Design an enzyme around this catalytic site. Structure first.
Site, mmCIF file in Angstrom:
data_model
loop_
_atom_site.group_PDB
_atom_site.id
_atom_site.type_symbol
_atom_site.label_atom_id
_atom_site.label_comp_id
_atom_site.label_asym_id
_atom_site.label_seq_id
_atom_site.Cartn_x
_atom_site.Cartn_y
_atom_site.Cartn_z
ATOM 1 N N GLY A 108 44.348 -67.536 24.974
ATOM 2 C CA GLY A 108 43.955 -67.675 26.372
ATOM 3 C C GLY A 108 42.596 -68.331 26.527
ATOM 4 O O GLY A 108 41.863 -68.051 27.483
ATOM 5 N N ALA A 109 42.247 -69.193 25.562
ATOM 6 C CA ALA A 109 41.043 -70.027 25.601
ATOM 7 C C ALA A 109 39.749 -69.219 25.701
ATOM 8 O O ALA A 109 38.731 -69.737 26.171
ATOM 9 C CB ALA A 109 41.118 -71.046 26.747
ATOM 10 N N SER A 195 46.434 -69.621 19.178
ATOM 11 C CA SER A 195 45.465 -70.396 19.957
ATOM 12 C C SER A 195 44.075 -69.791 19.782
ATOM 13 O O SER A 195 43.554 -69.683 18.676
ATOM 14 C CB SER A 195 45.812 -70.492 21.446
ATOM 15 O OG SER A 195 45.194 -71.656 21.958
ATOM 16 N N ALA A 196 43.453 -69.366 20.887
ATOM 17 C CA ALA A 196 42.171 -68.657 20.789
ATOM 18 C C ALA A 196 42.267 -67.426 19.882
ATOM 19 O O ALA A 196 41.292 -67.041 19.238
ATOM 20 C CB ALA A 196 41.675 -68.244 22.177
ATOM 21 N N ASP A 321 51.259 -79.280 20.178
ATOM 22 C CA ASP A 321 50.212 -78.357 20.614
ATOM 23 C C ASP A 321 49.250 -78.976 21.619
ATOM 24 O O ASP A 321 48.712 -78.262 22.474
ATOM 25 C CB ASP A 321 49.407 -77.848 19.430
ATOM 26 C CG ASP A 321 49.843 -76.480 18.994
ATOM 27 O OD1 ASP A 321 49.638 -76.136 17.811
ATOM 28 O OD2 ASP A 321 50.425 -75.765 19.834
ATOM 29 N N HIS A 425 59.103 -73.753 26.352
ATOM 30 C CA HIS A 425 60.078 -73.337 25.352
ATOM 31 C C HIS A 425 59.687 -73.764 23.943
ATOM 32 O O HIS A 425 60.218 -73.214 22.971
ATOM 33 C CB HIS A 425 61.448 -73.913 25.718
ATOM 34 C CG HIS A 425 62.585 -73.297 24.969
ATOM 35 N ND1 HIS A 425 62.918 -71.964 25.083
ATOM 36 C CD2 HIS A 425 63.475 -73.837 24.102
ATOM 37 C CE1 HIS A 425 63.962 -71.707 24.316
ATOM 38 N NE2 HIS A 425 64.320 -72.826 23.709
HETATM 39 ZN ZN LIG Z 1 65.298 -73.192 21.815
HETATM 40 ZN ZN LIG Z 2 52.654 -75.462 23.541
HETATM 41 ZN ZN LIG Z 3 51.143 -71.351 20.923
#
Ligand SMILES: [Zn+2]
Ligand SMILES: [Zn+2]
Ligand SMILES: [Zn+2]
Ligand SMILES: [Zn+2]
Ligand SMILES: [Zn+2]
Ligand SMILES: [Zn+2]
Ligand SMILES: [Zn+2]
Ligand SMILES: [Zn+2]
Ligand SMILES: [Zn+2]
Ligand SMILES: [Zn+2]
Ligand SMILES: [Zn+2]
Length: 523
Positions: A108-109, A195-196, A321, A425
């Site tokens: 969540g950055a 991510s974060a 990404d 997705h």
């Molecule tokens: Zn799928």
């Molecule tokens: Zn993504």
């Molecule tokens: Zn991800």
């Protein structure tokens, strides 16, 4: 005899819920809202939580830490937020013991998030039940402070920053002290996060604070080396907040004390990242994130990898990404009837390469547009913008971290992956957490195939440090990463012997780590 009952922790007794699974005696013990640190004070390090009398009912998720809503109009959460949650799988004969423990850190950055995650189809994203039961592991989730309240810093001792990283460390330490009582092996803790949260995982493995606490780690789409992780100019962002809330900006010590007694909701809403249009790329407005404090993060993370010499490590990325930051930086990649041009892409590239001037802009532009001569379609051009952001924000930092971890390894094993599929997705979290099995009406059979394989690899790794060896069969032998083989597992819906690949985008890795760095810096 087959379930936990009241668990004796350092703060006192804790009672959760037992959920019977299937027909033949299996179950899962669920604990929600165990405090691991005191109610927080704004911009102060976390403190021990006082013990309690009687039996704490750990029945419900507790409030997240105070943060901006997605509209950035208001806030929710509370200062009393440092709680964790535990899933313990139980077999049908006796209570589980010495289980691997996996601690999730959400992303969540560094700006938003909680230990339960977004709710969709009557299911929280980070519900640990499917991982725990399918992998025979314990799963811990928890809250840490985000935004200004988690990361405001002056760059010095007046306001050293990294409060949210210390929160994470306190949850890890609590798990090490207490998880045996729940049936966990405290010497076998694996951190994982996205991510974060993947960058947080990385920073926790590099911090001397965690000496002896962490056995293994998994960074998903983020490492400590990503450019959005370390804030190089925190005093600038602290001053921006001070001005908005009415604190003086002339003296750092006076400013810091004023910030500490400002309404925490005003601190949280002081700055809003503009939606569009922006003067700089999205990466520029990454503000309240970890800092090098000379303490929790003693040095630039690139120099800290000796601390992870005996921490087994997986790191990987998603094929697309960078598409979120790319979509903000070049909205044309969304609308099918709107062109990306050479001029638009040069502009974006030049913003990222300012320190190497005109020459650095051109060499980068030239290497990324080499394919545009033979394929000038908008599909190829828009893919190029996404690959560029993916490379600089996620893939290249991840490849450098893998090489640094391998070069410092003593007992540690190193592994690399690329997740390719087909919220959005394409994202790895839902498969790691087994949502295709928890809410199967929202997913196709191929999705359960992918999720089954990821949970098998992840929990085999938690158990043994070897994703191929554990309670679960895997579709492809995942070869450990070395400098020589530079191998990565490509995770897709149909895997076999050819899914083990090598040298992911190495011309671009070599461009960024050799060619671009050899250019003279311009001022
Ligand atoms: Zn799928
Ligand atoms: Zn993504
Ligand atoms: Zn991800
Ligand atoms: Zn409390
Ligand atoms: Zn909530
Ligand atoms: Zn409150
Ligand atoms: Zn034992
Ligand atoms: Zn500590
Ligand atoms: Zn900038
Ligand atoms: Zn510029
Ligand atoms: Zn092998």
């Amino acid at each position: 005899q087959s379930k936990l009952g009241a668990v004796y922790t350092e703060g006192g007794f804790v009672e959760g819920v037992n959920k019977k699974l299937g027909l033949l005696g299996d179950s899962v013990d669920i604990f929600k809202g165990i405090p691991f640190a005191a109610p927080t004070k704004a911009l102060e390090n976390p403190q021990p939580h006082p013990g309690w009398q009687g039996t704490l009912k750990a029945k419900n998720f507790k409030k997240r830490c105070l943060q901006a809503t997605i509209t950035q109009d208001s806030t929710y959460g509370d200062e009393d937020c440092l709680y964790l949650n535990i899933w313990v799988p139980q077999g049908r004969k006796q209570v589980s013991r010495d289980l691997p423990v996996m601690i999730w850190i959400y992303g969540g950055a560094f700006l938003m998030g909680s230990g339960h995650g977004a709710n969709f189809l009557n299911n929280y994203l980070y519900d640990g039940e499917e991982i725990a039961t399918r992998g025979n592991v314990i799963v811990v989730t928890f809250n840490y402070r985000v935004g200004p309240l988690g990361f405001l810093s002056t760059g010095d001792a007046n306001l050293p920053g990294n409060y949210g990283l210390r929160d994470q460390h306190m949850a890890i330490a609590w798990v090490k002290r207490n998880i045996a009582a729940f049936g966990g092996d405290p010497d076998n803790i694996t951190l994982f996060g996205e991510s974060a949260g993947g960058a947080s995982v990385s920073l926790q493995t590099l911090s001397p604070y965690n000496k002896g606490l962490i056995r293994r780690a998994i960074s998903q789409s983020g490492v400590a080396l990503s450019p959005w992780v370390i804030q190089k100019n925190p005093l600038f962002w602290a001053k921006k907040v001070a001005e908005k809330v009415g604190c003086p900006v002339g003296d750092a010590a006076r400013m810091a004390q004023c910030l500490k007694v400002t309404d925490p909701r005003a601190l949280t809403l002081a700055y809003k990242v503009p939606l569009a249009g922006l003067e700089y790329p999205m990466l520029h407005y990454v503000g309240f994130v970890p800092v090098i404090d000379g303490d929790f993060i003693p040095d630039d993370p690139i120099n800290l990898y000796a601390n992870a010499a005996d921490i087994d490590y997986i790191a990987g990325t998603n094929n697309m990404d960078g598409h979120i930051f790319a979509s903000i930086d070049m909205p044309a990649i969304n609308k099918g009837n709107k062109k990306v041009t050479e001029e638009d892409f040069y502009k974006l590239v030049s913003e990222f390469t300012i320190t190497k001037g005109l020459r650095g802009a051109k060499t980068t532009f030239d290497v990324y547009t080499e394919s545009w001569a033979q394929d000038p379609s908008q599909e190829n051009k828009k893919k190029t913008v996404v690959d560029f952001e993916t490379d600089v924000l996620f893939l290249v930092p991840t490849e450098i971290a893998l090489a640094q971890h391998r070069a410092n390894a003593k007992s540690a094993k190193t592994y690399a992956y690329l997740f390719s599929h087909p919220a959005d997705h394409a994202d790895d979290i839902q498969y790691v957490f087994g949502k295709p099995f928890a809410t199967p009406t929202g997913y196709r059979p191929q999705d359960r195939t992918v999720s089954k394989a990821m949970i098998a690899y992840w929990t085999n790794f938690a158990k043994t440090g070897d994703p191929n060896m554990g309670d679960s069969a895997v579709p492809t032998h995942w070869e450990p990463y070395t400098t020589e083989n530079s191998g990565y597992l490509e995770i897709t819906k149909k895997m076999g012997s050819s899914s083990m690949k090598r040298s992911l985008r190495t011309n671009f890795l070599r461009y960024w780590t050799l060619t671009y760095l050899a250019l003279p810096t311009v001022t």
